[PDB]
Amino acid sequence: NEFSVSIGAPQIPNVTWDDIGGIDFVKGEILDTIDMPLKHPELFTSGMKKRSGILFYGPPGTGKTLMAKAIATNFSLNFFSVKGPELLNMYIGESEANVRRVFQKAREAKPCVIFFDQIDSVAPKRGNQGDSGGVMDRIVSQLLAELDGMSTDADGVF
Amino acid sequence: FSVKGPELLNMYIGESEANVRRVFQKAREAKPCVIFFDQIDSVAPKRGNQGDSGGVMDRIVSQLLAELDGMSTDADGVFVIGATNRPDLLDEALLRPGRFDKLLYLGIPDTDTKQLNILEALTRKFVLDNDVKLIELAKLCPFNYTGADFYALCSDAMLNAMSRIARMVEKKVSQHNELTGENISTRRWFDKIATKEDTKVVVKMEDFLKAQEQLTPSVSRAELNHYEAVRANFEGA
Amino acid sequence: PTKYEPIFVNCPLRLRSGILLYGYPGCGKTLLASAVAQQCGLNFISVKGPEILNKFIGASEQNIRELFERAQSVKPCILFFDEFDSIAPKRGHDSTGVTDRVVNQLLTQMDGAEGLDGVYILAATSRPDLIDSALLRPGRLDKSVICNIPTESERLDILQAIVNSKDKDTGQKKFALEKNADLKLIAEKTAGFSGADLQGLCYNAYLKSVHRWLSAADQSEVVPGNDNIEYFSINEHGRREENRLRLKTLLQQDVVHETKTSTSAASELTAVVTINDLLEACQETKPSISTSELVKLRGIYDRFQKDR
Ligand SMILES: Nc1ncnc2c1ncn2[C@@H]1O[C@H](COP(=O)(O)OP(=O)(O)OP(=O)(O)O)[C@@H](O)[C@H]1O
Ligand SMILES: Nc1ncnc2c1ncn2[C@@H]1O[C@H](COP(=O)(O)OP(=O)(O)O)[C@@H](O)[C@H]1O
Ligand SMILES: [Mg+2]
Numbered sequence: 001n002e003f004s005v006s007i008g009a010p011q012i013p014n015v016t017w018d019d020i021g022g023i024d025f026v027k028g029e030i031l032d033t034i035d036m037p038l039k040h041p042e043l044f045t046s047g048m049k050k051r052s053g054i055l056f057y058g059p060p061g062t063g064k065t066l067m068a069k070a071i072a073t074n075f076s077l078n079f080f081s082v083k084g085p086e087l088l089n090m091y092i093g094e095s096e097a098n099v100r101r102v103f104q105k106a107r108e109a110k111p112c113v114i115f116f117d118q119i120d121s122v123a124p125k126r127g128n129q130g131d132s133g134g135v136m137d138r139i140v141s142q143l144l145a146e147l148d149g150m151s152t153d154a155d156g157v158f
Numbered sequence: 159f160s161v162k163g164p165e166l167l168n169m170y171i172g173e174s175e176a177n178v179r180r181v182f183q184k185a186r187e188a189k190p191c192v193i194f195f196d197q198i199d200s201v202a203p204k205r206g207n208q209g210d211s212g213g214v215m216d217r218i219v220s221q222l223l224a225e226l227d228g229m230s231t232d233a234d235g236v237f238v239i240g241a242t243n244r245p246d247l248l249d250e251a252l253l254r255p256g257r258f259d260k261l262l263y264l265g266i267p268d269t270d271t272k273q274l275n276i277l278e279a280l281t282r283k284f285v286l287d288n289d290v291k292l293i294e295l296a297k298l299c300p301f302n303y304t305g306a307d308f309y310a311l312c313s314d315a316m317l318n319a320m321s322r323i324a325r326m327v328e329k330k331v332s333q334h335n336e337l338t339g340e341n342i343s344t345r346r347w348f349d350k351i352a353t354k355e356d357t358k359v360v361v362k363m364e365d366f367l368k369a370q371e372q373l374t375p376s377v378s379r380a381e382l383n384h385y386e387a388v389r390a391n392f393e394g395a
Numbered sequence: 396p397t398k399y400e401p402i403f404v405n406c407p408l409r410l411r412s413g414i415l416l417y418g419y420p421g422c423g424k425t426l427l428a429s430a431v432a433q434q435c436g437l438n439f440i441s442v443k444g445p446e447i448l449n450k451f452i453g454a455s456e457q458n459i460r461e462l463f464e465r466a467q468s469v470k471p472c473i474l475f476f477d478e479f480d481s482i483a484p485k486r487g488h489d490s491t492g493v494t495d496r497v498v499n500q501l502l503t504q505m506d507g508a509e510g511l512d513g514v515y516i517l518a519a520t521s522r523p524d525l526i527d528s529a530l531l532r533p534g535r536l537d538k539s540v541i542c543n544i545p546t547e548s549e550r551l552d553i554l555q556a557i558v559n560s561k562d563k564d565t566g567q568k569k570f571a572l573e574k575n576a577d578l579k580l581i582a583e584k585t586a587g588f589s590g591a592d593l594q595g596l597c598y599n600a601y602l603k604s605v606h607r608w609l610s611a612a613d614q615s616e617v618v619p620g621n622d623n624i625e626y627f628s629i630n631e632h633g634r635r636e637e638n639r640l641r642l643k644t645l646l647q648q649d650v651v652h653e654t655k656t657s658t659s660a661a662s663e664l665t666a667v668v669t670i671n672d673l674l675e676a677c678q679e680t681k682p683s684i685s686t687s688e689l690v691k692l693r694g695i696y697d698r699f700q701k702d703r
Contacts (some may be wrong), residue, residue: 043605048598130488176454199486199495378703393497
């Protein structure tokens with residue numbers, strides 16, 4: 001906890017998975033998908049790709065954000081929350097630094113889950129506009145490319 | 159010495175009028191000769207909308223409308239020879255009888271060309287072994303075609319001659335055991351034999367048609383050419 | 396220009412206009428160019444995508460110029476503009492001058508002083524509509540060529556390469572097997588296959604094949620192991636008689652010094668691929684595209700040549 005408070009994220013994984021009722025073999029396939037690469041490593045200590053990322057697109061009112069912290073608690077994942085738009089900054093030419101920071105902190109916390117809540121805040125249509133290529137495009141395309149192009153070799157993050 | 163029109167727009171606040179004033183000064187500083195101007199889409203003056211919109215930028219056109227037209231009306235020393243294709247992208251604040259007239263059109267020759275003969279004449283400097291000129295068979299191309307691809311076809315014919323001599327030297331390498339203990343040292347062999355045969359050209363294989371019959375699609379023949387051909391009269395005059 | 400040029404140095408006429416590649420989406424390009432890098436010259440400047448569209452005025456027109464300069468000034472060097480969504484999708488549709496002047500930059504950089512024609516050129520765009528630009532002139536880019544979804548038949552070559560190509564001076568296989576049978580349905584009939592099954596014909600199917608070697612039998616029934624302290628029939632006392640917690644009250648005798656064992660073999664832990672695992676894989680087909688797109692893309696393909 002002292003490590004997480006000083007260097008890690010606030011609001012550590014701290015909930016009983018027992019409370020996420022009603023989800024079924026859907027939670028089965030999810031949980032097994034995040035369990036097996038974590039605790040059965042002989043099947044997974046290998047150079048191929050291994051289900052490094054997931055997204056969620058259900059309507060509001062079924063709890064995603066809760067189940068994310070819950071599954072993180074189920075295997076004591078290191079945890080970092082991108083609380084939406086805090087990647088943005090005034091300084092064109094430096095605002096991307098928080099993206100490199102995300103993989104810096106992930107790589108520093110090898111068994112980590114990285115959670116972009118409200119990802120829309122940094123995910124318009126990739127075919128955005130015929131207007132200017134404003135910062136909203138240059139941050140998101142670079143982020144998507146880097147999360148495709150790095151840690152894909154340094155396996156471990158989620 | 160020419161305007162290099164796309165470059166040399168300075169971004170810096172209120173600076174770039176300096177580059178227009180400099181370029182026309184450096185032009186006039188040679189007394190007798192023209193400036194080439196690319197497409198005027200290099201400037202793309204476009205009346206304030208759906209683009210630069212005349213606000214955060216005006217600095218080039220707001221000078222070019224005036225000062226070089228002043229020189230043009232005194233009509234000495236320096237002359238314009240711009241190469242516009244897309245007047246729909248331009249405001250027509252130039253390109254008009256009041257300033258810089260003579261919207262001059264030629265079109266593309268339909269099929270009757272001496273330019274086919276001049277094509278042959280510029281495949282020359284490299285040898286055609288035939289006694290017959292054999293040029294006219296190129297007119298088997300469907301009409302309205304006579305673009306710069308004439309020399310893309312001369313390039314393809316030359317590359318075919320290169321491919322022939324390449325496979326010939328590959329054959330010589332394959333039989334190089336006839337004069338060396340092994341089919342080895344090719345990168346030394348060609349230099350130490352060097353029995354002339356120095357890529358002497360083989361246009362005799364007429365492979366310009368062998369390219370052309372593929373309908374080499376870097377040619378343009380679409381309705382866009384008809385669009386230009388009609389609007390040159392209907393609006394380009 | 397590099398194998399036969401050194402023996403035909405006279406080099407009569409026009410320089411090579413490089414690559415005007417196109418193909419089906421998501422495939423068919425970087426896997427070639429990154430290997431062509433073996434002979435291009437220096438390791439070429441594969442800059443690509445939006446990176447050109449820096450900011451409102453001037454920056455792209457600076458960067459493209461310094462790009463061509465710093466590419467050529469050492470050695471022959473390709474670039475990687477790929478899709479014209481990077482530059483020159485159309486005239487107009489611009490703001491503050493971001494794109495269209497840098498298009499005219501491209502048309503002016505492509506002349507005169509490339510240093511060596513082994514710059515070549517490389518465009519690789521998917522879906523070669525949305526260009527409508529003069530750079531299709533023969534002296535600006537070469538002839539169009541398609542990369543396309545074939546019949547299944549080359550999948551056998553693809554599969555065997557993927558199995559056997561990646562090596563560490565070892566003769567290793569990514570997914571070692573002895574062929575239980577010929578590819579049969581896999582080579583020629585494996586699914587509806589309208590979209591390609593991609594690497595997804597092997598990915599996850601690998602783990603399925605591993606399950607029949609790691610999870611089935613022993614690991615589902617016992618903890619397999621050998622040597623060291625091991626299990627023993629200690630038989631010291633009844634497990635629960637005086638209390639429910641007598642069992643495992645005593646600790647082990649000694650800590651292990653060290654132990655040695657190979658990580659993988661054909662005997663153990665290898666992938667043990669089978670035809671019926673590929674049958675399961677092709678039952679789990681996920682075609683990358685559907686005919687509802689290809690009916691449009693086919694038009695976009697064929698209309699790209701002979702037509703404009
Ligand atoms: N087991 C459960 N199954 C379904 N819903 C649950 C469960 N447990 C709690 N909830 C409800 O899920 C709600 C969360 O809804 P939702 O995930 O749409 O919101 P959110 O976390 O604010 O969203 P966002 O992901 O957009 O930030 C909680 O208000 C809670 O009442
Ligand atoms: N034989 C193959 N067929 C199709 N795709 C392949 C093959 N081998 C590798 N790939 C994939 O090609 C991708 C890169 O190629 P590219 O055509 O640039 O894709 P994209 O069009 O999505 O950028 C990589 O993700 C790689 O996994
Ligand atoms: Mg949330």
